[PDB]
Ligand binder design. Structure first.
Ligand SMILES: Cc1cc2nc3c(=O)[nH]c(=O)nc-3n(C[C@H](O)[C@H](O)[C@H](O)COP(=O)(O)O)c2cc1C
Length: 147
């Protein structure tokens, strides 16, 4: 199985989450490519992957704002080869805000409307992902068991 993980992270929390997921998938035998959204180009990005995991923190407070490095990829998701692609989403946030992990919502809906197959409900991390490490591991298992 070949997996692509693409994350947007400002303070490193979604990046930690991405790397935790990456390690779980690699340890199970997947080929894993884990990239910062700041470094990627949208066109054809998902081609050749069995599974694509998109991670993004939520910003904005009074409105939903995607993590800033992820916005160009989000605005170009139509170019990535998402139709029929097996995908799932993750991200960090804080439930004291009105739109908790709203970026995960936004990315999931955009993917669904592009024809992607959402294989698991998104991973919505409240607070420090290091305090949710076992939820991350479990979700990574669940995703492997759903493709
Ligand atoms: C000023 C500010 C605004 C935020 N706004 C939101 C928000 O609207 N919704 C949310 O779920 N979390 C919100 N957060 C929480 C961030 O998503 C959280 O700090 C997250 O761990 C950052 O992940 P990152 O390091 O991958 O960027 C905000 C954080 C700050 C400091």
């Amino acid at each position: 199985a070949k997996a692509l993980i693409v994350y947007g992270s400002t303070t490193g929390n979604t990046e930690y989450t991405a790397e935790t997921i990456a390690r779980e998938l690699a340890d199970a035998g997947y080929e894993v490519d884990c990239r910062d959204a700041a470094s990627v180009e949208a066109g054809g990005l998902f081609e050749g992957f069995d599974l694509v995991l998109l991670g993004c923190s939520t910003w904005g407070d009074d409105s939903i704002e995607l993590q800033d490095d992820f916005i160009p990829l989000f605005d170009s998701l139509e170019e990535t080869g998402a139709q029929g692609r097996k995908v799932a989403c993750f991200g960090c946030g804080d439930s004291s805000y009105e739109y908790f992990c709203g970026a995960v919502d936004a990315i999931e809906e955009k993917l669904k409307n592009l024809g992607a197959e959402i294989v698991q409900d998104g991973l919505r991390i409240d607070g420090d992902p290091r305090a949710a490490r076992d939820d991350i591991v479990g979700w990574a298992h669940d995703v492997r068991g759903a493709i």
